[PDB]
Design a protein around this nucleic acid. Structure first.
Ligand SMILES: [Mg+2]
Ligand SMILES: [Mg+2]
Ligand SMILES: [Mg+2]
Ligand SMILES: [Mg+2]
Ligand SMILES: [Mg+2]
Ligand SMILES: [Mg+2]
Ligand SMILES: [Mg+2]
Ligand SMILES: [Mg+2]
Ligand SMILES: [Mg+2]
Ligand SMILES: [Mg+2]
Ligand SMILES: [Mg+2]
Ligand SMILES: [Mg+2]
Ligand SMILES: [Mg+2]
Ligand SMILES: [Mg+2]
Ligand SMILES: [Mg+2]
Ligand SMILES: [Mg+2]
Ligand SMILES: [Mg+2]
Ligand SMILES: [Mg+2]
Ligand SMILES: [Mg+2]
Ligand SMILES: [Mg+2]
Ligand SMILES: [Mg+2]
Ligand SMILES: [Mg+2]
Ligand SMILES: [Mg+2]
Ligand SMILES: [Mg+2]
Ligand SMILES: [Mg+2]
Ligand SMILES: [Mg+2]
Ligand SMILES: [Mg+2]
Ligand SMILES: [Mg+2]
Ligand SMILES: [Mg+2]
Ligand SMILES: [Mg+2]
Ligand SMILES: [Mg+2]
Ligand SMILES: [Mg+2]
Ligand SMILES: [Mg+2]
Ligand SMILES: [Mg+2]
Ligand SMILES: [Mg+2]
Ligand SMILES: [Mg+2]
Ligand SMILES: [Mg+2]
Ligand SMILES: [Mg+2]
Ligand SMILES: [Mg+2]
Ligand SMILES: [Mg+2]
Ligand SMILES: [Mg+2]
Ligand SMILES: [Mg+2]
Ligand SMILES: [Mg+2]
Ligand SMILES: [Mg+2]
Ligand SMILES: [Mg+2]
Ligand SMILES: [Mg+2]
Ligand SMILES: [Mg+2]
Ligand SMILES: [Mg+2]
Ligand SMILES: [Mg+2]
Ligand SMILES: [Mg+2]
Ligand SMILES: [Mg+2]
Ligand SMILES: [Mg+2]
Ligand SMILES: [Mg+2]
Ligand SMILES: [Mg+2]
Ligand SMILES: [Mg+2]
Ligand SMILES: [Mg+2]
Ligand SMILES: [Mg+2]
Ligand SMILES: [Mg+2]
Ligand SMILES: [Mg+2]
Ligand SMILES: [Mg+2]
Ligand SMILES: [Mg+2]
Ligand SMILES: [Mg+2]
Ligand SMILES: [Mg+2]
Ligand SMILES: [Mg+2]
Ligand SMILES: [Mg+2]
Ligand SMILES: [Mg+2]
Ligand SMILES: [Mg+2]
Ligand SMILES: [Mg+2]
Ligand SMILES: [Mg+2]
Ligand SMILES: [Mg+2]
Ligand SMILES: [Mg+2]
Ligand SMILES: [Mg+2]
Ligand SMILES: [Mg+2]
Ligand SMILES: [Mg+2]
Ligand SMILES: [Mg+2]
Ligand SMILES: [Mg+2]
Ligand SMILES: [Mg+2]
Ligand SMILES: [Mg+2]
Ligand SMILES: [Mg+2]
Lengths: 158, 134, 259
RNA sequence: CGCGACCUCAGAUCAGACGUGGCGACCCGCUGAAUUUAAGCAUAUUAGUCAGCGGAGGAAAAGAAACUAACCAGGAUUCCCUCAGUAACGGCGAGUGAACAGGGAAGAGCCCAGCGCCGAAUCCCCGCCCCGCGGCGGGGCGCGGGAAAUGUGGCGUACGGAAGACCCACUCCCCGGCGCCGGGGGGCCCAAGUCCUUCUGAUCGAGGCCCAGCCCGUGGACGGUGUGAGGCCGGUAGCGGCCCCCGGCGCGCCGGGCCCGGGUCUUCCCGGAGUCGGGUUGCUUGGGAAUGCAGCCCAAAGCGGGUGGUAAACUCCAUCUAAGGCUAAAUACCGGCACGAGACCGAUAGUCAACAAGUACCGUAAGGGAAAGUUGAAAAGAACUUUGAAGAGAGAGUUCAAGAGGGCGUGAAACCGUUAAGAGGUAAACGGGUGGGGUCCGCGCAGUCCGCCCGGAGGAUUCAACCCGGCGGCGCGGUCCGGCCGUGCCGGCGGGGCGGAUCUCCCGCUCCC
RNA sequence: GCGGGGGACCGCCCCCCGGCCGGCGACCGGCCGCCGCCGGGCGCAUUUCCACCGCGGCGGUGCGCCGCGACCGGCUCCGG
RNA sequence: CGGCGGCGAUGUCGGCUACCCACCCGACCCGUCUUGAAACACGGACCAAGGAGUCUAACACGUGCGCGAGUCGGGGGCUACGAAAGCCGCCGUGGCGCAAUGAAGGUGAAGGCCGGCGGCGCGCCGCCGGCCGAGGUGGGAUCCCGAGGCCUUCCAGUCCGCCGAGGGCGCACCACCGGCCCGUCUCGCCCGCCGCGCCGGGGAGGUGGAGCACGAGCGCACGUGUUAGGACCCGAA
RNA sequence: GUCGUCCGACCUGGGUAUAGGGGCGAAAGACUAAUCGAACCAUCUAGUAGCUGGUUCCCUCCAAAGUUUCCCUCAGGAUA
RNA sequence: GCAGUCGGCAGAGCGAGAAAGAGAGUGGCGCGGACGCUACGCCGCGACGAGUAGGAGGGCCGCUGCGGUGAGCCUUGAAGCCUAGGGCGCGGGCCCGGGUGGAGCCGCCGCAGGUGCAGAUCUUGGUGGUAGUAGCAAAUAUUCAAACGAGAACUUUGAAGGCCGAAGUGGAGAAGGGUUCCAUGUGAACAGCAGUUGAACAUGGGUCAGUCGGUCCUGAGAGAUGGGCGAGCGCCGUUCCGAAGGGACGGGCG
RNA sequence: CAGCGAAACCACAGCCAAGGGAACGGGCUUGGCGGAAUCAGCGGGGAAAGAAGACCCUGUUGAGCUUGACUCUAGUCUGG
RNA sequence: CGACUCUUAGCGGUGGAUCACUCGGCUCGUGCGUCGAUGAAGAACGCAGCUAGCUGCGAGAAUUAAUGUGAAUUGCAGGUUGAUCAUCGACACUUCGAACGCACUUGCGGCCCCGGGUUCCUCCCGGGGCUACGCCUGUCUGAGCGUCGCU
């Protein structure tokens, strides 16, 4: 029964909710395990950056967010084509690839192309056989000054 | 303070592990300190006791400077029996009373080759600690 | 408690008739547990009233400004000699209460250097009081892994750990804290302000960047400044007997007019 | 007729393998209620829930768009926060109820069929030899047998692909064996008081340990030991030690494989059907003129099809490319193996189960299902004497204690026996008020000190005042000397950090000869 | 032209100074003065300080228990 | 009271209470439902131990704390007790708040004075400029000014403090009147241009709104109340 | 004790068949393991109850209602 | 009402019917003085005090556990429990003395709750009165002597008197029970008195088959494969939508 | 009588008359009065025990059965 | 007075509360994440010098071997060149059970081989190895008025 002036409430507790209650007492355990998996990954890919491959600049859709740019899934094949990077060697030198993504405008295409050309300028590539350097591989000075990068690779700013 | 997350400090777990310990772990629990002269001779503080150590009782009713050999190491009630450490029943027969080896000072070991091997191992690990500290 | 506790029987009430009290009772069998009062908080066996669930709200979030407020207030109280003595720390011979020892002692390794440092800083009497307060706890905490209780000695607060934690951690009552990670639970134990603190020098100097002055915000926090005093002169006696108030007071009526 | 192909179908204790069944906390596929709520009840809700059935794995399922969107567009799946108790559904009542965008955790993609070309270039099995031989694999020889043209393998898959011609450009990936160099299990160990007194049944208690303020302390977690232990013992701490074992990780050798690309132009090629879609029926959904699924009927097309949350026609546009397949991580885990912990419970509690507990016992059966911890420090568990047929006593003995005697720590109350005292025909009991008697208590029983002054004898190297030294408190001592501090300010031939939606010489990058 | 670097400006903060002002009672030193206390001297008993005595006085508090009286004041009930 | 008395060591003093007994007066057995219980209403032979408004979520209001036109890291990440605590700001995504109204398309919270010009017939009915500018009335805690005055032989004569007729600014708040915003209705004249349109904007008067009219919210904690959950505990056919 | 029947629709053992909205019934709603106008076991399930019963320490302060209106309302709510 | 304890830096006022200043300037010896004030405290006046349902406040009331604290208590005796002892508080309750007990416990500030019992035909356990009461009465019946034995109404033996009366109170089997069968010992517990006895308890023993039964057969029926159905575990079906014969004599050949 | 030895039930209990009272008291008021502990009987009383009235009514509680109740459905008839 | 009854105290019984202990739970979290026709899960029956239960084990039966360990086990007996414990990788592992020759009685077979028997010629007895369903690849024997070809 209702009393005087108050809200009409509809609590969704008419099912047997107490079997499927998910407590979070393993929250710092999940956080601590995710942290150790992150440092294990970072230790495994030792000079490659810890967060992962480079992600492109994408405009969010759906007018609430279309002023904001963010990181997309991968560089699109025409962006790699204009940057002159093979779409199978991109994922080997650390470039995210999205085959599914179209371009509709020139400027986002060119901004991600310049991002690719800004990333290959920073890329220090170790030779494939360690006692024999090859044609496009980085020189022994940037090999000795290679470090593991933290955070997103060249993070995206508004 | 213990920091190892695999070693328990739970009272009931420690008590269960102590009172259900198998006999070769019981031997290590039933360990007696050596004498001051035996400490300066072998550089060993503590040793598991055997069926032939000449020992002294230093705590209890049967304490004193008298020396008796261990005659039985009764691992199931965690006690040992020493020679003149006895009491008489109603009927006049003497029985041996149980003494815990922590209240027992060893003044003469049964030196077996196993015992000498254990004594050398304990002395060497103690000296590794002493020469690691500096 | 387990949610199956006391509900692991089949039990029907006998209904009316039978001259018994209408509670559910155990079915059949030749044993003691037969017609013997199964469900309900009032029976032997059976679940308790309102069985405790795991999803009680165990955890309480406090606002970040209030958590820094309490750290500020506990630190501020740990510099007044009356409040720490009312907390019971034996400081009647320490040479200054915000007791800052120089930064060499963060590089300690052995416990004997720590003990000699406390003895020469006259804070060893607090550890001796902690030793005197070592005793067994009254009650079921002894059977619940909390056999021994003891009071708190000082809190050594440091900037960088060059072995001071291992050199001090075997002395009872001493809590080690980094200035970047100051704990209100360890800086006001029991909710009572007045914990004795022994600072190191760089630890002491980083306080004006961790929490700020009033003119400058906190350099090591995002947006935090020191809280503001609701009154600035708290010397009520000095306020009241100052001439400005006394010229405006009326004459006091100090005379007892009984019946 | 007979012989031989092939196809289809049998038989075999033919040769070699594989499945069944269990567990089931988590997961997948079906099937699927009613109690309940609506203050009745039938749609609804409960609930795609319980029960039932099938199938797994260490995760499963899902998963690389026949997608979201309408934006300046995003970009597999899964999970978290928010979206949001919202859009929407609903006897529009009760109630139910998502999705996209956004921020994160994680992050990885790929393969067929089809279309094409390559002397089927492909696969399986038996025989011999050599190796390796406890995951049955590698090399070679078989005018050895089958499979397969009713299509195996190589290239190749919608992000396009292939071939030819022209250019540009390197010879290093991986398999099978093998030896050589520098995390995991298990075992054994590693500091310091039994120091001097003293309490005690026993001390681990209490006091002391000087001029090293007993000793160690990277160890003062815990447990055991006759109360209570950092130092008696096991342990604890430590980038502490040693010995095996199993890996992972590098280099080296033999044999075998693979003898491979990017760009430009030209010429060709390109797709999954009783499936989509329509009607209807039934279930399902927030999906409302039908979200998904399924039955039945109809039944496709290729500048086509699907979607674009209101049925339909015309016309633009956008977005994918269905009817084939694989895929870790984040995610889940009340079963299991091994652990750790606790502001939990403390034997009518906490699991049914602290103990010979899913036991004893009950029911034909499916099933149901208890009660029950504690002598003591140590059995030292009462020898011997005596009564009695004996149980049971009386002595004696052990123990600190039997006032702890083998269902024995503590030993309450109900109830009972006995002793003591008091009482007694309106059942007892009670409230108020006294009185009497007991039990003890007040260790009551010639009763209080305190301050000042007077007197009396007594004692004291003793008061005031002055000298020295130390300590403390208090005119800025108007305007004594110097410092420090200001949620004070002004000045600057000042020397710096931080911030700002305040303005304006070099480098990278993009068109332009 | 883009993005980034450089510079200037502005604000706030920190540190050198030069100057007022305030506080040192959440925060001082030095000397000078006054006081108080402690110690050591000198002082030496009509002073001072101890302990006893009187059934001492003064002022406070209570009497061991059982009692009684006196007046004062308040409230009452009466009576002459 | 600056008044007295008596009794005391093995039989007496005190002990309101506490054990028993005696007597007078009072006095029916509790719990419960009920207009009404001592009831010929039900439960209760006795004793011990157990035994019933909890927790989660939401909302409301009140109160406490912090910050405040903002607030909040709860999810994620970085660095024995500690599974804690500290930090992140180019982790404020996001929630709630700062804006409402309409079914929706949608729209969305003061205006007046001056200089210039019966077009009409904004003297009325727009735009060029400047200025002033967020309403008023009544009450209203506080506060402000002050005709005069608060004595010590008596006239002055100054400063400070206090009191004060009367007059003021008026907090919060209340009541009323205007004003502004969205829906809708009625009347009526204009203003705009890239497209002069079945276009767009404006005014006056009412009226519907959970609005504005110089914020008050957010987070946390506590308390009560109402619910959804086994829901204070036991109970069906 | 007295009774019905006691060569026939007779009595009886063992084996077998039918199982819960089902069986079986010379029919009484009888029987179906002391259970039958729907057996027994476990679960859904701590099913719901406007209806009975109970609901645990002290002191202090304040202190009611059985009336209005609406309700498949009359042993109950909402509202004042 | 009280911060006014405003002291040789002194001057000790502010109850008094009547708005305000115990205001300030300048001209005309002996070293003294109760208490107070946990300001959440203390003090003073006046009025008042019923209470169900219900609401609120204060609890130096109580339980358990946690965080602080008491240089706390404790084997020269903790908790618990008993008490004709002493007391305190309006009360919840608490403190102390005695005794028992034999190892832990409590005060204060906060925190948390599975936190206070006379009831619920409450749950579990224990104990009363009833009460040495009801009762040990269905089927005719026992008596004498002896033995053993600590002990005899009841065991055994003898004698007597009786009953079942061949549809038995006899001799044997089925099913079922499972060692109850047999011998010896015991008399604690049980056999509703007893017991020297037992189907009790404890020690040892005991069941021998070609022909006796099972085994084999088929009955009423149960039930696979085939087949069919079924989401499925599976179900129907039993000669039915089956290539259902693995057998034998003779002949030939090795 | 010897041996053995329960259970139901129980607020406290147990002599009456009248009164009032929840309209038939063992208790209360007013009277009558009242004397240990007991045995065998007995059936007036304890509105005696036995079992949360089965009759009646209420509940927005059911179930068995019926039909011209409401809404469905197996089967069956008929069409495509 | 006594007996009986009531009350209180002391002592003693009955009873097992309270308290103090706690090799047990409950809850949370971490790591691993493994059964079976080579016979699992489960069940039955046995196994110790005295052994009923529990536990351990399987006719090698409270355990065998190997390694680590290093002198016990213990309720009573008896008897370091390795006792006892732990680890467990070697070996073994009765009957049933998916349970597997057919059945469920401990019933009945069949094939092959070995030993007694025989004098392999059968019998008989003992022992060993096989004998279930479905299904895959392959092999062999075949079936068909299925489709052909050849003579
Ligand atoms: Mg209400
Ligand atoms: Mg990451
Ligand atoms: Mg329980
Ligand atoms: Mg306690
Ligand atoms: Mg085969
Ligand atoms: Mg309903
Ligand atoms: Mg209802
Ligand atoms: Mg109903
Ligand atoms: Mg549903
Ligand atoms: Mg299920
Ligand atoms: Mg399976
Ligand atoms: Mg598995
Ligand atoms: Mg998949
Ligand atoms: Mg998505
Ligand atoms: Mg919301
Ligand atoms: Mg639903
Ligand atoms: Mg999204
Ligand atoms: Mg091909
Ligand atoms: Mg291929
Ligand atoms: Mg694709
Ligand atoms: Mg000591
Ligand atoms: Mg210890
Ligand atoms: Mg100990
Ligand atoms: Mg010590
Ligand atoms: Mg040691
Ligand atoms: Mg050690
Ligand atoms: Mg270690
Ligand atoms: Mg539905
Ligand atoms: Mg369209
Ligand atoms: Mg549409
Ligand atoms: Mg495809
Ligand atoms: Mg696909
Ligand atoms: Mg128990
Ligand atoms: Mg207990
Ligand atoms: Mg239990
Ligand atoms: Mg006991
Ligand atoms: Mg004792
Ligand atoms: Mg005892
Ligand atoms: Mg006892
Ligand atoms: Mg007497
Ligand atoms: Mg009377
Ligand atoms: Mg009632
Ligand atoms: Mg009535
Ligand atoms: Mg009553
Ligand atoms: Mg009556
Ligand atoms: Mg009733
Ligand atoms: Mg009753
Ligand atoms: Mg209780
Ligand atoms: Mg609030
Ligand atoms: Mg932890
Ligand atoms: Mg409300
Ligand atoms: Mg309930
Ligand atoms: Mg509730
Ligand atoms: Mg129920
Ligand atoms: Mg019949
Ligand atoms: Mg009838
Ligand atoms: Mg009702
Ligand atoms: Mg009622
Ligand atoms: Mg009152
Ligand atoms: Mg003990
Ligand atoms: Mg609790
Ligand atoms: Mg009770
Ligand atoms: Mg009789
Ligand atoms: Mg008998
Ligand atoms: Mg016999
Ligand atoms: Mg014969
Ligand atoms: Mg069948
Ligand atoms: Mg008799
Ligand atoms: Mg009566
Ligand atoms: Mg009376
Ligand atoms: Mg009668
Ligand atoms: Mg009734
Ligand atoms: Mg009834
Ligand atoms: Mg009704
Ligand atoms: Mg019905
Ligand atoms: Mg007990
Ligand atoms: Mg061996
Ligand atoms: Mg060995
Ligand atoms: Mg048979």
């Amino acid at each position: 029964a209702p009393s005087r002036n108050g809200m009409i409430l509809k609590p969704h507790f008419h099912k047997d909710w107490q079997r499927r209650v998910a407590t979070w007492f393993n929250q710092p355990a999940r956080k601590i395990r995710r942290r150790k998996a992150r440092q294990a990954r970072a230790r495994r890919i030792a000079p490659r950056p810890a967060a992962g491959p480079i992600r492109p600049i994408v405009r969010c859709p759906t007018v609430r967010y279309h002023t904001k740019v963010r990181a997309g899934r991968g560089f699109s094949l025409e962006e790699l084509r204009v940057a002159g990077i093979h779409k199978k060697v991109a994922r080997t030198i650390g470039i995210s690839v999205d085959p599914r993504r179209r371009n509709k405008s020139t400027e986002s295409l060119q901004a991600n192309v310049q991002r690719l050309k800004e990333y290959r300028s920073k890329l220090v590539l170790f030779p494939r056989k360690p006692s024999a350097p090859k044609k496009g591989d980085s020189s022994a000075e940037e090999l000795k000054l290679a470090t593991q990068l933290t955070g997103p690779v060249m993070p995206i700013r508004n | 303070m213990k920091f190892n997350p695999f070693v328990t400090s739970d009272r009931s777990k420690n008590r269960k592990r102590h009172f259900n310990a198998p006999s070769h772990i019981r031997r290590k629990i039933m360990s007696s300190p050596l004498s001051k002269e035996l400490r300066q001779k072998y550089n060993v503080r503590s040793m598991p006791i055997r069926k032939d150590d000449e020992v002294q009782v230093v705590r209890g009713h049967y304490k004193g400077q008298q020396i008796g050999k261990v005659v039985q190491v009764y691992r199931k009630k965690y006690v040992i029996y020493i020679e003149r450490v006895q009491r008489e029943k109603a009927n006049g027969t003497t029985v041996h009373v149980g003494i815990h080896p922590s209240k027992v000072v060893i003044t003469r070991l049964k030196l077996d080759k196993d015992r000498k091997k254990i004594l050398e191992r304990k002395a060497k690990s103690r000296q590794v600690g002493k020469e690691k500290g500096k | 408690v387990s949610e199956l506790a006391g509900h692991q029987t089949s039990a029907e009430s006998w209904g009316t008739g039978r001259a018994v009290a209408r509670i559910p009772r155990v079915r059949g069998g030749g044993t003691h547990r037969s017609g013997q009062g199964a469900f309900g908080n009032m029976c032997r066996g059976g679940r308790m009233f309102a069985p405790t669930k795991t999803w009680r709200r165990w955890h309480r979030r406090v606002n970040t400004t209030q958590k820094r407020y309490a750290i500020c207030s506990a630190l501020a109280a740990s510099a007044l000699p009356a409040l720490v003595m009312s907390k019971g720390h034996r400081i009647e011979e320490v040479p200054e209460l915000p007791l800052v020892v120089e930064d060499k002692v963060e590089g300690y390794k052995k416990t004997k250097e720590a003990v000699l440092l406390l003895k020469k800083l006259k804070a060893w009497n607090d550890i001796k009081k902690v030793y005197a307060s070592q005793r067994m706890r009254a009650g079921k905490g002894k059977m619940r892994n909390r056999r021994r209780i003891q009071r708190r000695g000082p809190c050594v607060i440091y900037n960088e750990d060059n072995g001071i934690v291992k050199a001090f951690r075997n002395i009872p009552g001493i809590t080690l804290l980094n200035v970047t990670k100051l704990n209100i639970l360890k800086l006001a134990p029991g909710g009572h302000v007045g914990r004795f603190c022994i600072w190191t020098e760089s630890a002491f100097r980083k306080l004006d960047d961790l929490y700020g002055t009033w003119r400058k915000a906190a350099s090591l926090k995002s947006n935090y400044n020191l809280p503001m005093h609701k009154m600035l002169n708290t010397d009520l006696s000095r306020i009241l007997k100052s001439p400005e108030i006394q010229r405006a007071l009326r004459a006091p009526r100090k005379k007892i007019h009984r019946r």
